[PDB]
Short mmCIF file of C-alpha atoms in Angstrom, two decimals:
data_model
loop_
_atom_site.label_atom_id
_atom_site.label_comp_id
_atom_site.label_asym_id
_atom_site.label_seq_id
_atom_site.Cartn_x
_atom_site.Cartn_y
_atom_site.Cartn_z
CA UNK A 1 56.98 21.50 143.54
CA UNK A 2 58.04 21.24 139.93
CA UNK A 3 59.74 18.54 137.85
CA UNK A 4 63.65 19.53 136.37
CA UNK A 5 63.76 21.94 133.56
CA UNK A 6 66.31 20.09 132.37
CA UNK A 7 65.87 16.22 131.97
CA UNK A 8 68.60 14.82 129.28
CA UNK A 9 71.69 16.96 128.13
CA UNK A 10 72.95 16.43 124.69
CA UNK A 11 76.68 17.19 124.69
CA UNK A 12 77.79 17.35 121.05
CA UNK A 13 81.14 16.15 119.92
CA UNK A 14 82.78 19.35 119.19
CA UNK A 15 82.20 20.40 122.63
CA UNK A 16 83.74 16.86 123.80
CA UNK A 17 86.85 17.78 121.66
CA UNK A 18 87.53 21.18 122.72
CA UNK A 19 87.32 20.69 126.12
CA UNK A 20 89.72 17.58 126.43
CA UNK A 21 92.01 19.22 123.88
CA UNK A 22 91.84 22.09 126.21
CA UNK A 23 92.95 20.33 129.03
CA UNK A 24 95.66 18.25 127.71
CA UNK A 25 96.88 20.83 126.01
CA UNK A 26 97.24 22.91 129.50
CA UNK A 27 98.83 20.05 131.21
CA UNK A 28 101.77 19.65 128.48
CA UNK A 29 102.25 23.26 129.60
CA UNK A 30 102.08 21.91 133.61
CA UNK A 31 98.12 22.49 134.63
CA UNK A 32 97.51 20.44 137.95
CA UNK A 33 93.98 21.64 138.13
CA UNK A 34 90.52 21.21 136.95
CA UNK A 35 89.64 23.25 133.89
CA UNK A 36 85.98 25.49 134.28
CA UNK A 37 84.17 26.30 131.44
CA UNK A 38 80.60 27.81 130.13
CA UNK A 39 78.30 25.36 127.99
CA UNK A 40 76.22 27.32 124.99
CA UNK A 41 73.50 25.76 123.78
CA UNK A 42 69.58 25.59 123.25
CA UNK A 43 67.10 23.91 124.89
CA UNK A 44 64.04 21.97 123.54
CA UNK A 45 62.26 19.09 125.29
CA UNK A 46 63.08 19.25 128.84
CA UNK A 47 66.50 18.41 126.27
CA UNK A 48 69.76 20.93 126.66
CA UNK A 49 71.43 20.53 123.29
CA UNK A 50 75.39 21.44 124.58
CA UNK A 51 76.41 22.86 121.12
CA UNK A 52 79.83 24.91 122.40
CA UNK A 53 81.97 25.65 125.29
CA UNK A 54 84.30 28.27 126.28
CA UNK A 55 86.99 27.66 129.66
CA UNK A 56 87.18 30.39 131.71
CA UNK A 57 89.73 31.57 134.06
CA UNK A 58 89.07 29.80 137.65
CA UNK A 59 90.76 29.60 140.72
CA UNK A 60 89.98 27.37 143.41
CA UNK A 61 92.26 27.27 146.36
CA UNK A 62 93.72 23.74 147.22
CA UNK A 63 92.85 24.23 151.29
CA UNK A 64 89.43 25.66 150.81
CA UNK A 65 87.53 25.17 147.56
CA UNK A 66 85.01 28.07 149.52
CA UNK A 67 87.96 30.32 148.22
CA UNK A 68 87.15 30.41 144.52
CA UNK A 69 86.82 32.87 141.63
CA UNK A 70 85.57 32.88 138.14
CA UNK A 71 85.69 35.95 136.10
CA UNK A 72 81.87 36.73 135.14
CA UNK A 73 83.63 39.18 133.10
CA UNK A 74 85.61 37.13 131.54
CA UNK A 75 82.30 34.85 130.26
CA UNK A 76 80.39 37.92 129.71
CA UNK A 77 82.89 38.77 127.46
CA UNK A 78 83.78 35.50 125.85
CA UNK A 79 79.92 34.83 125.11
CA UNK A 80 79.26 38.28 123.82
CA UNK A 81 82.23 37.72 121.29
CA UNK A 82 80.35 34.31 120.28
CA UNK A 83 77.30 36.20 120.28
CA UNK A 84 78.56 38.12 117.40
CA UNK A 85 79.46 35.11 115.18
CA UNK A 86 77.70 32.03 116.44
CA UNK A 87 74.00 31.09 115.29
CA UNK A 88 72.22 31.79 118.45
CA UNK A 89 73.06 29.83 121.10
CA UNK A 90 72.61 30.70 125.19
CA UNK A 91 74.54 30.00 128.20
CA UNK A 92 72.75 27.26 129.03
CA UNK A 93 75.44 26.18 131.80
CA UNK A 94 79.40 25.03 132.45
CA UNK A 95 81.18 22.38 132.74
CA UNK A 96 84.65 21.07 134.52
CA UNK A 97 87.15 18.10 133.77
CA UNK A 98 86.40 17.11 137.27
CA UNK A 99 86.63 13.66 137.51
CA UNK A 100 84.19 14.22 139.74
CA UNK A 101 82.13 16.97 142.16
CA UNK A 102 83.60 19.37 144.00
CA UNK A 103 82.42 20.53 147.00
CA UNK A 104 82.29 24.58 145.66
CA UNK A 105 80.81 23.37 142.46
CA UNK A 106 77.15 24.01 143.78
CA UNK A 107 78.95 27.63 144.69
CA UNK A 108 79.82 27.62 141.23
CA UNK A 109 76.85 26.92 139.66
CA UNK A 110 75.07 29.87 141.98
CA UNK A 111 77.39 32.18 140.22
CA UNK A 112 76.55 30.69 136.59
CA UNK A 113 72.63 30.82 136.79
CA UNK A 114 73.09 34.37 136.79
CA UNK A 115 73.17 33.29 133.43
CA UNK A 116 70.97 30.60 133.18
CA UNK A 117 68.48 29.74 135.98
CA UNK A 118 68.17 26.37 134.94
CA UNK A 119 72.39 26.14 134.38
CA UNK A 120 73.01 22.36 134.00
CA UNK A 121 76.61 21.41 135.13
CA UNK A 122 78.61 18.78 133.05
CA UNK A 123 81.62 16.83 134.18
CA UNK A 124 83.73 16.14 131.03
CA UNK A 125 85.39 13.14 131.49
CA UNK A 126 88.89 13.76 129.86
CA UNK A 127 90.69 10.95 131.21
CA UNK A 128 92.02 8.81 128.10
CA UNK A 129 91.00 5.62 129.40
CA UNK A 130 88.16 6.13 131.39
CA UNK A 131 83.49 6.25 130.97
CA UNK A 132 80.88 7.67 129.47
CA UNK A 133 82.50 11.09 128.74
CA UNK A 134 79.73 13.33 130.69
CA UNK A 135 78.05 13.33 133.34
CA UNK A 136 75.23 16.34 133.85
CA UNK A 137 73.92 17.78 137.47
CA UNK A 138 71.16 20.46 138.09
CA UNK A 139 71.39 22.00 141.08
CA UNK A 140 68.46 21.30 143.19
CA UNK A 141 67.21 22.57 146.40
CA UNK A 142 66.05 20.26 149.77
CA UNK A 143 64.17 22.03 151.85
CA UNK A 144 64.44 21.06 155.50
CA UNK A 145 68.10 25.48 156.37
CA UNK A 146 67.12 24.92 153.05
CA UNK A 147 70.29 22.76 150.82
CA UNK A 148 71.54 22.63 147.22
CA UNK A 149 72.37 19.89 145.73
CA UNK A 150 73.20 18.13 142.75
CA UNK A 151 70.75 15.75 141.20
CA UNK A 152 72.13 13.32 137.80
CA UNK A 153 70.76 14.56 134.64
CA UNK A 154 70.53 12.02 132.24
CA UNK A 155 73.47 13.06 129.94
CA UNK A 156 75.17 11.95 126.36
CA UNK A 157 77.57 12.12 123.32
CA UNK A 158 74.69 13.57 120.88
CA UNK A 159 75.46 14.54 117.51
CA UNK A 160 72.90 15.01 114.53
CA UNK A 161 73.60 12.76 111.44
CA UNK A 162 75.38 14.77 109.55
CA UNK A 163 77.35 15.92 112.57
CA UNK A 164 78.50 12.71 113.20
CA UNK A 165 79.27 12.21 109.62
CA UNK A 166 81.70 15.17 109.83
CA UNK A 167 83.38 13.95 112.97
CA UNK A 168 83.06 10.03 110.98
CA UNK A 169 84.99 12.18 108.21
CA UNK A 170 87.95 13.95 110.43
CA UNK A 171 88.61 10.55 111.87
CA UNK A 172 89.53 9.37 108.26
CA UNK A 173 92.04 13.07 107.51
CA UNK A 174 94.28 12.46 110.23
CA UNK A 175 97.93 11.70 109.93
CA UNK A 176 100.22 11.39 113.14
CA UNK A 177 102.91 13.70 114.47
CA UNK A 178 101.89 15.99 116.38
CA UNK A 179 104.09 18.09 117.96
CA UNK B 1 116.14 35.99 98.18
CA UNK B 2 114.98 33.43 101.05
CA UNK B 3 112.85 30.34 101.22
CA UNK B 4 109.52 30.36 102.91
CA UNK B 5 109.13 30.47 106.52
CA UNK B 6 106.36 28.05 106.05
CA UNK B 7 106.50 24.55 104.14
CA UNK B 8 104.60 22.92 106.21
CA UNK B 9 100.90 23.41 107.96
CA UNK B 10 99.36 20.71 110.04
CA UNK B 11 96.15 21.46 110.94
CA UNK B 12 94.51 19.78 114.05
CA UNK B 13 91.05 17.99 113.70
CA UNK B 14 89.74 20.15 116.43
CA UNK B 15 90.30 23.04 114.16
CA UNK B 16 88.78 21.11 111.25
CA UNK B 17 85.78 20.00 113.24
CA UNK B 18 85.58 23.87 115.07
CA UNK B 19 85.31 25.47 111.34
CA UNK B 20 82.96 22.60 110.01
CA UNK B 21 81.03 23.20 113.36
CA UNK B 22 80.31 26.49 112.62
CA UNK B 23 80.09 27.11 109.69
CA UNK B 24 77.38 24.15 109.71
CA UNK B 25 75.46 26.03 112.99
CA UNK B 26 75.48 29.39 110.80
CA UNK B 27 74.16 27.91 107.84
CA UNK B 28 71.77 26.62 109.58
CA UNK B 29 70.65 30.32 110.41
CA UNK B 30 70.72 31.35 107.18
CA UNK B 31 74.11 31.92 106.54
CA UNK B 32 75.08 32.37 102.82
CA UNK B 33 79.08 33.22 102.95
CA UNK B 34 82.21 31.96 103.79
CA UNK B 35 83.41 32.30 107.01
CA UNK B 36 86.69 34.25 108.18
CA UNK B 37 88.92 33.25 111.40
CA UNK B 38 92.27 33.40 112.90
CA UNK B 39 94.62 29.90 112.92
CA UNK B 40 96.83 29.79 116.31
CA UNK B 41 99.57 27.33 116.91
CA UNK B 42 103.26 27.15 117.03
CA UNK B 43 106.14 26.57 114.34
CA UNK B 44 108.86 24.10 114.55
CA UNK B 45 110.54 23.66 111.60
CA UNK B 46 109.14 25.50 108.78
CA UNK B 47 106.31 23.30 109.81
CA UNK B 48 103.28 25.48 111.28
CA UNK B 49 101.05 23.61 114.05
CA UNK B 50 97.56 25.17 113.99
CA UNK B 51 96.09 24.14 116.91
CA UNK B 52 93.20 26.39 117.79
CA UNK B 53 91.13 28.23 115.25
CA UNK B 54 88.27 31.61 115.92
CA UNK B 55 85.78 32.97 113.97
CA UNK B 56 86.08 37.14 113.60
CA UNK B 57 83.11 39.18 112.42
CA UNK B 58 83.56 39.59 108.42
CA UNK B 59 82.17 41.22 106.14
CA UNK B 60 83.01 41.53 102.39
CA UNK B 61 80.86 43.22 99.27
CA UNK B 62 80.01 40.75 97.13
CA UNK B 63 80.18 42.84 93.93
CA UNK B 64 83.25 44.44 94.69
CA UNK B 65 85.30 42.70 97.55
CA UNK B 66 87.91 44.85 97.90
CA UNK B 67 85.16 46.42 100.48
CA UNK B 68 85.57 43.97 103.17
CA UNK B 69 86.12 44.47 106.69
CA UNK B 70 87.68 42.02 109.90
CA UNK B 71 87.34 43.87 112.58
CA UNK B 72 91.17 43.11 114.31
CA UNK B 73 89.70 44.85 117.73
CA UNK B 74 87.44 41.62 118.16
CA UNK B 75 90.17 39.48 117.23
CA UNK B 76 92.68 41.34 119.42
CA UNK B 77 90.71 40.78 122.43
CA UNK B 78 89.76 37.03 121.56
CA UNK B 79 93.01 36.24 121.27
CA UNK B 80 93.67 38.25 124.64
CA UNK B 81 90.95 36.01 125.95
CA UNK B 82 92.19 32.65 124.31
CA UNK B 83 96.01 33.07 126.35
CA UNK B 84 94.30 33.83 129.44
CA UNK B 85 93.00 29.98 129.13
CA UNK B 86 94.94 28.60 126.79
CA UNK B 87 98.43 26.94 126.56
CA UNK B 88 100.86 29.48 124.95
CA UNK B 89 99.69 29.42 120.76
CA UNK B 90 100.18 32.58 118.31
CA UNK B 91 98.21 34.13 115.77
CA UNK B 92 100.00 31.98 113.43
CA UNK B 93 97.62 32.74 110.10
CA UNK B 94 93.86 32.95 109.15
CA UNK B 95 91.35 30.38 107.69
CA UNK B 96 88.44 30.92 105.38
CA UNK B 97 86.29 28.00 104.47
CA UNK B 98 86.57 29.02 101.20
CA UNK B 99 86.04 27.28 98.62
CA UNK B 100 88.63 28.92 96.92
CA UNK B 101 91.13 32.04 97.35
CA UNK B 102 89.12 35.21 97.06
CA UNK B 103 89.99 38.30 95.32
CA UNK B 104 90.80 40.22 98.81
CA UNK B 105 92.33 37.11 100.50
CA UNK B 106 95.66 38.93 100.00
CA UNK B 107 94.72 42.15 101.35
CA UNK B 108 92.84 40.47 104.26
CA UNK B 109 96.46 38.55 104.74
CA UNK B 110 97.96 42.10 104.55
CA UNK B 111 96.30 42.67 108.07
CA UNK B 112 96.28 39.17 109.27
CA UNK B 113 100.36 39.96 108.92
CA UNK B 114 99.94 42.97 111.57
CA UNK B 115 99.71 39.60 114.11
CA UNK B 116 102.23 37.29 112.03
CA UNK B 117 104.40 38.12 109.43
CA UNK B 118 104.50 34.60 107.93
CA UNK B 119 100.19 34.52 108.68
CA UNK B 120 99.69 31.48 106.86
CA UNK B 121 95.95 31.44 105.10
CA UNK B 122 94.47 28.04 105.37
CA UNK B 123 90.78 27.22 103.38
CA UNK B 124 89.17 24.97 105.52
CA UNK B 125 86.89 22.75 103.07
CA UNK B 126 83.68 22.40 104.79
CA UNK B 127 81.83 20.63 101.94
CA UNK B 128 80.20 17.16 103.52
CA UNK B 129 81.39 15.24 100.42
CA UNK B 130 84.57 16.71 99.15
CA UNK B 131 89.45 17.51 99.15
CA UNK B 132 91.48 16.99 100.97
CA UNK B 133 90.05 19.41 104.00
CA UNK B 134 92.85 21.98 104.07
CA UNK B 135 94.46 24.07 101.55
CA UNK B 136 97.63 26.29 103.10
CA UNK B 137 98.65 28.81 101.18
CA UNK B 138 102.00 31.62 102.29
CA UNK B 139 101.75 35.09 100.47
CA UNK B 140 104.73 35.47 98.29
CA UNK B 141 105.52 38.83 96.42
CA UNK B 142 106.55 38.66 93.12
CA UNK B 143 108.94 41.44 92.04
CA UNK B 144 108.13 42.63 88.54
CA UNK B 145 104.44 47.79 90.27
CA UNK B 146 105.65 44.46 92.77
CA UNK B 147 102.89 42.02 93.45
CA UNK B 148 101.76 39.57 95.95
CA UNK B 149 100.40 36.28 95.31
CA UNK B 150 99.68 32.75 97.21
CA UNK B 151 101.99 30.46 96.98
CA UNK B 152 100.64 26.82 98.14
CA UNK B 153 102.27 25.58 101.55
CA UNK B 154 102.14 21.49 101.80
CA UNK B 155 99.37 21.06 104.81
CA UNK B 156 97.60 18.15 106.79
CA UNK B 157 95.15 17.20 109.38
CA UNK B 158 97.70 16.19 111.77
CA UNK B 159 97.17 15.20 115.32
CA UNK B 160 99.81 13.60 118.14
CA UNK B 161 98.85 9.80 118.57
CA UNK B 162 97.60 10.82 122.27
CA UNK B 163 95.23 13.45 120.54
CA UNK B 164 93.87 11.46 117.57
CA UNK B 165 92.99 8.67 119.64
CA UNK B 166 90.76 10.99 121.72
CA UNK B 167 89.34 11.57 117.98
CA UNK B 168 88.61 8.05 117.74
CA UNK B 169 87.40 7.55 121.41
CA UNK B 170 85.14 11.08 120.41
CA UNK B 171 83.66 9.01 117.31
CA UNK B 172 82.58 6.04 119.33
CA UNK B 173 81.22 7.79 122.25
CA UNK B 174 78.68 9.88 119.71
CA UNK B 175 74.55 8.62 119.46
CA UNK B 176 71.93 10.23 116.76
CA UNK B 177 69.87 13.31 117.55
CA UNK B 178 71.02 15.66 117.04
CA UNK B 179 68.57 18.90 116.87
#
């Protein structure tokens, strides 16, 4: 029985950005919910470089997280569009704002290795003042009715040099206000 | 004869690091042109909030670039896509990353204008060491055959306190490697 695919998940900063921008953006305008998203990326040593991100319409009902839907549509179309601008870059899994598992995210994650057999979850963190911003899960079966489950992926903030010089660089541009 | 709609563009970092971001990834692959997108946001006060940002497929001949081509299908339906997700933004303009206005920017602000009449044109600067990162400009005709031209809007990186302290927490979460 095989090791992980995946073994350390490289979320880069833009991704980090987007997706709590996202979500506070949605809750100014009164989300009470999770937000579900796909992760793009590449994959090189065992490593899944998280390069971009996309949220994706998903419904989860409040009694009974079994009663869910994403629109594979919806992603299908959303990563075809990248597709036609992006330098290469795969489904390589999702994400949520969490804060932590739910209990139809293994359903979930069924539904995105469609896309990506080896589809790594990440839990953004995008609580203000919370933490270690990610946390990554590969689903992983335990034979027995065999069981899914998710197993910790070592995860992390990852940004190439001059990446990280960029984001160094917007820090310095901002001014405040806002609205 | 009125004012501009427009005196004011703040840009959010998550724009400027989206537009760095990818223009970085294509270049990478072998890019060797600027890149074209749509700005969304919201206006206040003759002050334009770009908030969200998409590349669009672009093409443009580069001995004669009044052969050019956005294809406003693709950003039609990304922009469907974006407010099924997204807090309520409008096309509110374009971006290129420039460096500078091109021959066609006015004609490709002719059909930006189909989605927003005051389309404000934004170069992103996406030079590592350069500027002063935005550069808005409004098209303004000048009556005379009558003529259009860009007339510079006053624009900023601007981000709510909330939002560029998730900038700063971004910048200290962030470790090297990278590829």
């Amino acid at each position: 029985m095989p090791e992980l695919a995946v073994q350390k998940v490289v979320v880069h900063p833009l991704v980090l950005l987007s997706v709590v921008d996202h979500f506070n953006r949605i809750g100014k305008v009164g989300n009470q919910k999770r937000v579900v998203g796909v992760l793009l990326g590449s994959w090189q040593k065992k490593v899944l470089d998280v390069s971009n991100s996309f949220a994706v319409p998903f419904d989860e009902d409040d009694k009974d997280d079994s009663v869910w839907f994403l629109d594979h549509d919806y992603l299908e179309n959303m990563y075809g569009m990248f597709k036609k601008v992006n330098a290469r870059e795969r489904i390589v899994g999702w994400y949520h704002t969490g804060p932590k598992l739910h209990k139809n995210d293994i359903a979930i994650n069924e539904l995105m290795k469609r896309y990506c057999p080896n589809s790594v979850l990440v839990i953004i963190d995008v609580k203000p003042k919370d933490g270690l911003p990610t946390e990554a899960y590969i689903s992983v079966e335990e034979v027995h009715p065999t069981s899914k489950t998710f197993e910790h992926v070592t995860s992390e903030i990852g940004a190439e040099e001059a990446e990280e010089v960029g984001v160094e660089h917007l820090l310095r541009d901002i001014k405040d206000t806002t609205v």
